[PDB]
Structures are given as C-alpha cells and as structure tokens.
Nucleic acid binder design. Structure first.
Lengths: 108, 105
DNA sequence: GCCAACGTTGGC
DNA sequence: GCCAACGTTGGC
C-alpha cells in the first residue's frame, strides 16, 4: 500500500496514448460517477484489476499501476453527464468550468 | 466529400473521432472509429445512421461523419511491431501528415 | 488469480 | 444466416 496519487500522476498515462473519462448518471437512489480508461489499443477498462492484467500483458514503459485512479472525484480526463428531458435521455460532455460543481455534487 | 469543419461539428457535441493505422496483409491502412456521447464505439457508417435514428435529432447529421482515415480530425494512433510485441502509439500533430501521405495512393 | 462456459455484438 | 471478437458469470 502506497500514498494517494497526485493529479500529475493520474495525468501521466494521457501523455502515453491512454484516455480517462468520468461519466455521471442518476442511480437507484442518487447521482454517481464511474471512471473508464481506454488503453492505447482502444480497449475499454472499467475496473482496476482489468488495468493490472493489461499492464502485465503489454510492454512495461513509463505507465505503471500507481498512475491509475478510478475516482470520479479526480478532475483528470473528459467528464460526461446523463441529462433527462421530456425529449429523452441525452449524454452531454461537461465544460472545464462545469466539472468542479459535478465533483462537489458526488462528494459526500 | 465532408470538409474538416463539418467533421469537427460532432466533436463539439460529445462525440470523439480516432484514426488507427496498422500493417495489413500487403500495405499500411487506416480505419476510423467514433465514440458517441454515451461512450458507444462505432466502426461503420451504417452503425452511426442507426445511432442517429435512435436519438434526439439536433445539430448532428449523417453528413457530419467521415470514416476516411485521410481526414485529419481527431486523435491518430499507429500499431508498431517490435521484438517486445505489437505496441499502439498515439501520433503527434507533427507525425500525422506523413502518416496520411503514407496511406494515400 | 486464472480459466471455462456462455451470452452478446458486429460485420461479412 | 454464421462466427470471431468481445463481455459476463461462476467454477476452484
């Protein structure tokens, strides 16, 4: 077990072909965020053990297990939220200005 | 044909575009992927048509999509074969024109 | 942690 | 229509 990851560490894989997304939607009871990673090959990964397996099956360069966080409250990568309207459910990408209020909204 | 400005329009409405370049049986070739705002990966134009028909009609139309890997919009990746194995790398803005030329042709 | 069985998807 | 590739579930 190690110290908490810094925002600069969580940004590191995004300089080596990875993408990080946070997706916010209304659950059974409340709003909640989930974090996805995309590997450089385009593989979608939704769970930390999946990232561990991927790193083990690929060449070890600068990206390691300590540069990954599945926290939707870490402001790294693209943020999206599922907005319901009479017209229907619509996913919308958040602006840099909007992200802080959403992170606060899903912090207990 | 679509203009770069047209192909950029969905990217202002939560879509993502990627071009992926790899060695085929005979030559280097490119393919285009889109991600919808909901995170759905779409590799074929007819899948985008189906997706648009199933969703609210606003600014984004079929004419805003290009599956041409020669269209310089979105992020570019390339599969390199090395002794350590196949490795995908994201291309820099500097590298992309040379790779588009290499798959034109 | 890994792997078999099985369900789903996408594209020919 | 099929079936390779991908995702899910449950076994030790």
């Amino acid at each position: 077990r190690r110290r908490i990851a810094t925002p600069e560490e969580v940004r590191l894989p995004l300089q080596h072909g990875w993408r990080r997304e946070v997706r916010i939607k209304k659950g059974s009871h409340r709003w909640q965020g989930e974090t996805w990673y995309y590997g450089p090959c385009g593989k979608r990964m939704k769970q930390f053990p999946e990232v561990i397996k991927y790193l083990s099956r690929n060449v070890v360069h600068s990206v390691r297990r300590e540069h990954f966080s599945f926290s939707p409250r870490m402001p790294v990568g693209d943020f999206f939220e599922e907005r319901d309207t009479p017209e229907g459910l619509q996913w919308v990408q958040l602006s840099a200005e909007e992200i802080p209020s959403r992170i606060q909204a899903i912090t207990g």
